[PDB]
Amino acid sequence: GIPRNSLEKFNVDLMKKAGKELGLSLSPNEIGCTIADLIQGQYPEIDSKLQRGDIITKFNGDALEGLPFQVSYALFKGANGKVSMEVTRPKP
Amino acid sequence: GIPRNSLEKFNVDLMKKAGKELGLSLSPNEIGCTIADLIQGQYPEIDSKLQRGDIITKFNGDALEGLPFQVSYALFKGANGKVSMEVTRPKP
Amino acid sequence: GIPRNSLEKFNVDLMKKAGKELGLSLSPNEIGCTIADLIQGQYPEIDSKLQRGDIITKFNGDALEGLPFQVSYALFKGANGKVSMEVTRPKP
Amino acid sequence: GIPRNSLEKFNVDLMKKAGKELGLSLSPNEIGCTIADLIQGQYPEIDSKLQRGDIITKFNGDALEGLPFQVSYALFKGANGKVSMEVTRPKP
Amino acid sequence: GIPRNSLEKFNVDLMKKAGKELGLSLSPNEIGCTIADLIQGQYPEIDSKLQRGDIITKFNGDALEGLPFQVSYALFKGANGKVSMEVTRPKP
Amino acid sequence: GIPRNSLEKFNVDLMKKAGKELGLSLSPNEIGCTIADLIQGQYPEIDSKLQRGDIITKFNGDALEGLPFQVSYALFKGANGKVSMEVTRPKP
Numbered sequence: 001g002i003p004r005n006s007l008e009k010f011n012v013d014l015m016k017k018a019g020k021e022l023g024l025s026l027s028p029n030e031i032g033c034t035i036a037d038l039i040q041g042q043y044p045e046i047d048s049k050l051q052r053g054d055i056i057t058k059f060n061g062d063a064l065e066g067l068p069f070q071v072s073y074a075l076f077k078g079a080n081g082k083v084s085m086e087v088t089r090p091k092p
Numbered sequence: 093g094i095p096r097n098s099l100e101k102f103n104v105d106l107m108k109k110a111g112k113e114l115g116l117s118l119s120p121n122e123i124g125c126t127i128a129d130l131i132q133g134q135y136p137e138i139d140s141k142l143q144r145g146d147i148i149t150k151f152n153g154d155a156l157e158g159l160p161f162q163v164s165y166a167l168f169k170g171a172n173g174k175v176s177m178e179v180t181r182p183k184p
Numbered sequence: 185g186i187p188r189n190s191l192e193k194f195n196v197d198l199m200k201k202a203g204k205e206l207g208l209s210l211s212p213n214e215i216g217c218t219i220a221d222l223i224q225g226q227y228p229e230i231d232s233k234l235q236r237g238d239i240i241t242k243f244n245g246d247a248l249e250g251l252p253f254q255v256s257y258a259l260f261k262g263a264n265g266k267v268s269m270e271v272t273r274p275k276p
Numbered sequence: 277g278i279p280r281n282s283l284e285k286f287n288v289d290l291m292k293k294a295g296k297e298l299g300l301s302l303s304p305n306e307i308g309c310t311i312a313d314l315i316q317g318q319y320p321e322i323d324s325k326l327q328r329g330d331i332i333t334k335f336n337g338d339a340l341e342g343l344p345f346q347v348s349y350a351l352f353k354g355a356n357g358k359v360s361m362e363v364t365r366p367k368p
Numbered sequence: 369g370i371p372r373n374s375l376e377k378f379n380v381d382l383m384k385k386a387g388k389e390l391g392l393s394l395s396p397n398e399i400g401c402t403i404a405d406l407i408q409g410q411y412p413e414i415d416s417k418l419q420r421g422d423i424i425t426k427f428n429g430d431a432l433e434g435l436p437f438q439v440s441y442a443l444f445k446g447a448n449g450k451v452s453m454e455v456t457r458p459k460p
Numbered sequence: 461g462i463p464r465n466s467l468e469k470f471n472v473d474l475m476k477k478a479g480k481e482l483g484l485s486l487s488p489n490e491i492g493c494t495i496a497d498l499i500q501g502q503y504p505e506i507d508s509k510l511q512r513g514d515i516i517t518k519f520n521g522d523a524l525e526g527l528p529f530q531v532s533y534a535l536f537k538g539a540n541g542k543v544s545m546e547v548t549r550p551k552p
Contacts (some may be wrong), residue, residue, distance in 0.1 A: 001251060001531045002522060003258035020287015025145045026182040028121050030526070031253050033196030036126075036145030036182070036222075037214050053209045062462060066490065067093060068434035069123050069182070071461050072097035076184035088251070090210040090220070092260035093439045093461015094430060102274045118274040120213050122434070128218075128237030128274070154370060158398065159185060160342035161215050161274070163369050165186035168276035185347045185489035186338060186369015214342070218331065246278060255277050279528060279534035292503060301421025302458045303395060303402045307529050308386075310487045310496055312402055312421035329496035343369060345399050345458070350371035352460035359541025366486045366496075366529070368536035393513025394550045395487060395494045403515035404494055404550075435461060437491050437550070442463035444552035 007031070007088040014043035014083050016018060022046070022047060022058075022083075024077065027071035031088075032057035033076075050087065058086035099123070099180040101149060101160065104142060106175050114138070114175075116148075121160035123180075124149035125168075140148035142179065150178035193216070193241060198227035198267050204217060206230070206260065206267075208240075211248040212253035215272075216241035217260075234271065242270035283307075283364040285333065285354035290321040290359050298322065299358075304345035308353075308364075319363070326363065334362035375399075375456040377425065382413040382451050390414065390451075394444070396437035400425035400456075402442075418455065426454035467548040469517065472535070474505040476542050482506065483541075488529035492517035493532075493536075510547065512523075518546035 016022075023046065032055045041047040050077035057064055059075050060083060108114075115138065117129035124147045133139040149156055151167050152175060200206075207230065211223035215238045225231040241248055242260050244267060292298070299315035301323070308331045316323055333340055335351050336359065389454065391407035391414070398424045400437050408415055421436070425432055476482070483506070484497035492515045500507055517524055519535050520543065 001255045001279070001527055003262060003277070004252070004254045005258045005261070007254060007257060021183060024184065026184065027126050027145065027211070028123060028145075028166045028182075028533065029121070029253075031212060034211050053211065055211075063464065066436035067439075067461055068096070069121075070096045070099060070434075073099060073182065073184055074097045077097070078095060079184075090212075090257065091262075092206060092208065092210065092257055093434055093463070096431065108218050110362075110547070113271060113275060116276065118276065119211070119237065119239075120274075155372065159347075159369055160188070161213075162188045162191060163185045163276065165191060165276055166189045169189070172186060173330035177247075185343055185371070187369070188339065247280065249529075250277055250528035254526075277531045279538060280528070280530045281534040283530065283533065283536065297459065301419075301428065303421065303423070304399065305488050305529070307488065312404070312496070313419075327485075327497075329487065331487070336395070338395050344372070345397070346372045346375065347369045349375065349458060349460055350373040353373065354371060366485065366533060367481065368486070368533055392551065393511075394517070395513065395550070396489050396491065404496070405511075436464070437489070438464045439461045440466065440549060441467065441552055442465040445465065446463060451493065 007057070007090070009086045009088050010049065012085045012087055014045045016079050016081055016083050018080070022079065024076070026073070027070065028077070029055070030066060031055055032064040033072055046071050051089070052088050054087050056085050060084055076083045099149070099182070101178045101180050102141065104137045104177045106137045108171050108173055108175050114171065116168070118165070118168070121147070121163065122158060123147055124156040125164055143181070145153070146181050148177050148179050152176055158160050180182055190233055191241070191274070193270045193272050194233065196229045196269045196271055197231045200263050200267050202264070206263065208260070208261070210257070212256065213239070214250060215239055216248040217256055235273070238271050238273050240269050240271050243270055280338045285362045285364055286325065288321055288325050288363055292355055292357055292359055298352070302332075302349065303347060303358050305331070306330060306342060308340040309348055327365065329367070330363050332361050332363050336360055356358045377454045377456055378417065380413055380417050380453045380455055382411045384447055384449055384451055390398060390444070391437070394424075394441065396440060399423060401440055402430040419457065422455050422457050422460070424453050425453050428452055469546045469548055470509065470545055472505055472509050472545045474503045476539055476541055476543055482536070486516075486533065488532060489515070490526060491515060492524040495533055511549065513551070514547050514549050516545050516547050519545055
């Protein structure tokens with residue numbers, strides 16, 4: 001199936017100061033976790049970089065492609081301290 | 093891939109009184125059907141328990157994980173009488 | 185898993201006059217690409233036929249079922265001239 | 277991904293008998309169940325029409341594409357008498 | 369899709385030794401890794417309990433269902449000593 | 461899921477000849493096509509470099525990861541001359 005490309009990525013790094021739900025509502029797919037909701041974030045990173053529909057493809061170094069949601073969800077839930085995410089905006 | 097957990101679930105039971113689209117717009121994924129739209133439901137259950145982005149993981153006893161959407165869609169379409177759903181809210 | 189059906193489809197044909205993002209924000213799944221966003225389209229077709237949550241199942245003749253998003257995304261990105269899409273509205 | 281073929285299918289029909297296993301070890305995949313191994317001498321129809329590597333795509337009327345192995349396996353295990361399968365030999 | 373069985377699991381335990389490969393060729397699938405081929409004579413436990421076509425579903429405590437093969441394979445490759453597997457024999 | 465390896469790849473190159481089948485029975489999976497079975501004696505390069513269980517991951521320049529088998533199979537079937545494959549031997 002010849003045509004195949006990138007999916008340009010951008011980073012979103014934040015500090016997980018306990019007492020905060022990242023605010024991200026997620027949806028699992030083959031390439032990562034789709035953002036369903038983003039209640040006006042609490043990280044300049046999320047607020048000025050993320051939007052509904054964006055797909056988080058890597059979390060703290062772990063590629064999310066192909067991972068069962070039970071695994072990816074656990075990764076997000078265990079976020080403590082410096083959180084770093086790679087994201088792609090699927091708008092051809 | 094060590095970290096792996098639950099996905100806490102909650103139930104939504106309603107009475108399928110003919111003449112009503114459940115109002116649920118769906119999206120298929122590996123763990124179930126994602127709710128795309130929920131036009132102000134017509135079941136105290138849906139209205140006070142469901143939101144866009146929630147994932148229905150079981151319908152009338154049939155687990156939706158891994159099912160082709162052609163199958164899950166048919167299950168919803170054939171809903172008649174007591175409808176019972178297990179749902180998870182993917183917000184780490 | 186006995187129950188299995190159709191997914192009625194409808195078409196959306198437009199003219200790709202350069203200088204326009206189709207405006208479609210996409211989400212990959214097993215049957216096609218889910219529309220995440222549809223900024224008030226620029227094609228009578230998209231504006232009067234598409235809505236958030238709809239799933240594009242075929243693009244210019246290529247069925248999108250089972251295709252890696254890296255492939256489908258590339259197909260949309262390379263759209264030039266007469267664009268034809270088959271879509272399904274997942275509302276049981 | 278342009279090239280996409282419809283696969284050739286042949287039929288295998290037999291009558292299961294108590295105490296006589298089908299003798300097929302199955303491996304699930306997106307289009308059906310691959311015969312990972314088979315014991316010759318169980319049923320004449322299997323010996324005459326099936327070979328290691330063949331992929332069973334329909335079992336007693338139910339299409340196996342996309343089904344979780346827990347469902348496909350249940351279908352095979354639940355057949356006490358008539359067995360009708362559609363199969364493809366994946367040897368390009 | 370109503371019929372859906374919980375698969376029978378058996379345990380295989382061994383102590384890996386330097387210079388002695390497990391001798392198993394693996395094929396990934398949704399529930400685990402199918403033993404596509406195996407060389408007899410490597411480990412007594414494999415010779416006594418495993419056969420071509422068996423599907424390894426858990427490896428040293430990690431469930432293999434849904435894992436990308438790049439992860440499952442890494443788990444197998446990383447075992448230098450104790451190996452504990454859960455396995456199912458898919459022969460309906 | 462932390463552990464995730466990049467798999468070792470080797471090349472297989474041959475010139476297909478009319479009347480001489482490749483002799484490979486393929487089984488689709490997420491990373492490519494497993495050689496479920498193969499008939500020795502067809503091509504010297506296959507006899508010298510391939511074995512049952514090997515997984516073909518690229519065919520004549522097209523990566524096979526994630527492709528529907530209907531597409532991968534079409535690629536193999538469409539090769540009338542030069543055949544260049546990338547392959548991995550999944551034996552941890």
